[PDB]
Design a protein around this ligand. Structure first.
Ligand code: SF4
Ligand code: SF4
Lengths: 459, 459
């Protein structure tokens, strides 16, 4: 009853899975330590800007009254200083204090940290990535370290670069930058490597395919210009290296003000007790069938009821269930997990201990929002409140007519299991009073907002 | 024990519902009479070119071994002479003579008639619509009868226009043409009227919203060009008039070489015996929950399991159920009824006598195909064979590579409940083995053919 939640925030995407992969990797590694007894947290949850579990939903999902939120982002700017605290409801803008933003929201102590890329331990993670990218014999002393920035003035990266120069285990360290579409152009890298070899580490959480193409073109330009250039070993993005989890832990601690921890959140616990009572009877939630299976719980798609075990792909972890359900049957990403697009073909066998994380990853926010609606205490947010928060390209949703929003919502939300309470639709029973398809929507989602944007820009 | 089936064939659509409502209106009227005892057919079924029940499916749905197929088309031309016979598998092209084309296919004797538009009874239906359209005091001999054709070469309508002149009930009779996108265009109609009034009857099964705006547009042009034009009364499409049912009956009767009749098709009868068995125990079929309800049956969406009965819209006829499931929750047409897009919010209560029609209109061909697959005898048609039947802009599907079709099918078919047997996908268990989402796909559908056409076109 000194209990604490860690939340990790990633960018996410409507379309590309890689963009959640760094957050999901680190989350699972830290839970792993929790299983082993070396985690100063009692749970590790995820939230995303551009998919579910969303920024607006993530504090509804935390089990405990003491929460630490760490941004798994490598730059300090718009997204981290404006977008994430605004969507989180932290009422803060601009530079984050070292040590973080401390708030009281819900019945909850929340502390929002500086981003991952700001922590000095990122210099260690870079160096480790670089050494792991080399071939079995090679003295780093003979290797020049190239650090690939995503944008021009990443002040943190320059700092890490100078730390690694001083520590002196590389022949040299250069910051490289791809051109358009002062740091050294990647297309020129051999002009800076007079002897030995080079190694490239992207200072990136991940590498999407357009980005990867920009990069290999840059390198092909280099090689055309310098046809006998040093051997170059190209690493993966530092955001996927195992060391980032240790950096996340250091960031999470620095700035902590109170050492007491928190307590369990009662509303949340009540929701999950109801969920357990249902799982024990057997029951259905969305497109998922839950079946007690001795001392375990099986989950499968309701369409796959009665289907032979060996005609299914079985998993036995919450994470493997998440992964199997991340894309639809065409292989396309599912950013809104309540969409009526859950793929067939899978089975999950879960321990009683793992059931909650399993459902929370499969259907984020649904157990808690449903239970709250069942008991008429789900408060929802009108379109106007949502539209008025948006900045960037999304601010334009503010000039959508109520006809435009209804028309777009009719089309978008038809794909979804939820009922759009924020648009005046009503929901009388939920998953907790017998109805598998009875799920509340409390607020216009990121896929709806983008569609309204597009409609508004069509003129 | 002389048993016979009538099959009505319409155009249908991927996107719009009018193009089937004419066929559905006639079919439903004729089933009503068959209960009043006043029908020479023991069932009335539907099939469509561009939606389910499709031309490839409809004959497998017929209960009897003697079948009459009437095209509800107001033309007699390439579509009725070449396309419908080719898709139905009749082994016929060109002119169909009065009395039909007779074939033995499967176990059935099938007679394919001339189209609705070719029967001389259509003059009576046109006159009746004309009379109904006049201010009900009006005297016909004071009125010029204008007949709107879709396209220029409607020789059948010209035949009728001449019969109606000879009857003489009207001041005169002229054909005019829908606007492009030597009978005179509708925008010139007063050039063909010498009486002091006119009545326009569209020789169409239906009038979509596009074509309706264009008709209004043409009428505005006529009114400017001819400020002296007399008053025009505008009737709806003749295809929607109750008098068309009597013409269909007359067409069905012409040429029945005999008055013997047929027997029950045993394969079809077996599949419905299997379904009845499943129904008395309660079962799930795709996205539908089938429950014994005393001596009737209840159907609802599986997502609505447990939902309060009074929160649902109740229907009690197969046709009502069909109408309520015709569109998705965005109001978009569902041409392929096995798509995972069945709307929520309804319940059907059906007598045992209505169960089969109910299920056949809700999910065309699913019962029979599923039954046949479990008995290891569902015959599938390979892609290249489908592609090769096609003509026009659609023949372009013939250019798609195996990878191109595999790529489009993964994207399109992801929306579908069915498993593409024709593409080498296998299905080990169907609805009849207790798997709600186990449904076979025996042949590429019109929605997938159009998607492959667009892909080839884009590349
Ligand atoms: S806004 Fe619409 S699509 Fe998004 S979660 Fe809500 S109901 Fe679903
Ligand atoms: S071709 Fe694909 S979308 Fe069409 S009915 Fe078959 S499985 Fe369904």
């Amino acid at each position: 009853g000194a209990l604490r939640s860690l939340v990790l925030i990633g960018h996410g995407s409507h379309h590309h899975g890689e963009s959640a992969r760094a957050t999901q990797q680190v989350a699972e590694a830290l839970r792993g330590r929790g299983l082993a007894g070396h985690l100063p947290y009692d749970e590790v949850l995820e939230g995303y800007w551009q998919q579910e579990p969303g920024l607006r939903q993530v504090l509804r999902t935390v089990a405990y009254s003491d929460v630490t939120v760490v941004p798994v982002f490598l730059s300090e700017g718009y997204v981290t200083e404006t977008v994430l605290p605004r969507e989180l409801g932290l009422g803060h803008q601009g530079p984050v204090p070292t040590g973080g933003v401390v708030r009281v929201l819900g019945g909850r102590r929340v502390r929002y940290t500086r981003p991952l890329g700001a922590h000095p331990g990122m210099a260690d993670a870079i160096a480790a990535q670089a050494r792991d990218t080399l071939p079995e014999g090679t003295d780093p002393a003979d290797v020049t370290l190239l650090l690939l920035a995503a944008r021009p003035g990443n002040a943190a990266l320059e700092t890490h670069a100078q730390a690694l120069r001083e520590r002196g285990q590389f022949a040299g360290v250069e910051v490289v930058l791809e051109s358009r579409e002062s740091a050294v152009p990647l297309s020129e890298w051999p002009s800076r490597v007079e002897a030995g070899q080079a190694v490239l580490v992207p200072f990136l959480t991940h590498l999407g395919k357009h980005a990867a193409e920009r990069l290999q073109q840059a390198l092909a330009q280099a090689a055309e210009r310098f046809p006998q250039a040093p051997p170059l070993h190209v690493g993966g993005p530092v955001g996927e290296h195992p060391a980032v989890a240790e950096v996340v832990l250091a960031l999470a601690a620095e700035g902590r003000e109170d050492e007491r921890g928190g307590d369990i959140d009662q509303a949340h616990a009540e929701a999950w007790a109801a969920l357990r009572h249902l799982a024990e009877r057997g029951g259905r939630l969305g497109e998922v069938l839950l079946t007690p299976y001795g001392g375990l719980f099986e989950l499968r798609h309701t369409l796959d009821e009665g289907r032979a075990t060996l005609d299914l792909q079985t998993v036995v972890t919450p994470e493997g269930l998440r992964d199997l359900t991340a894309r639809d049957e065409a292989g396309r990403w599912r950013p809104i997990r309540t969409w009526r697009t859950l793929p067939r073909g899978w089975r999950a066998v879960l321990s009683p201990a793992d059931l909650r994380l399993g459902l929370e990853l499969l259907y984020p926010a649904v157990i808690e929002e449903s239970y709250a609606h069942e008991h008429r205490r789900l408060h929802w947010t009108p379109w106007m409140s949502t539209a008025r928060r948006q900045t960037g390209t999304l601010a334009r949703v503010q000039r959508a007519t109520p006809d435009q929003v209804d028309t777009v919502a009719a089309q978008v939300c038809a794909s979804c299991l939820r009922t759009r309470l924020w648009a005046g639709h009503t929901l009388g029973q939920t998953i907790f009073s017998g109805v598998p398809g009875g799920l509340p929507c409390a607020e216009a989602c990121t896929v709806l907002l983008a569609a309204v944007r597009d409609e508004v820009g069509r003129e």
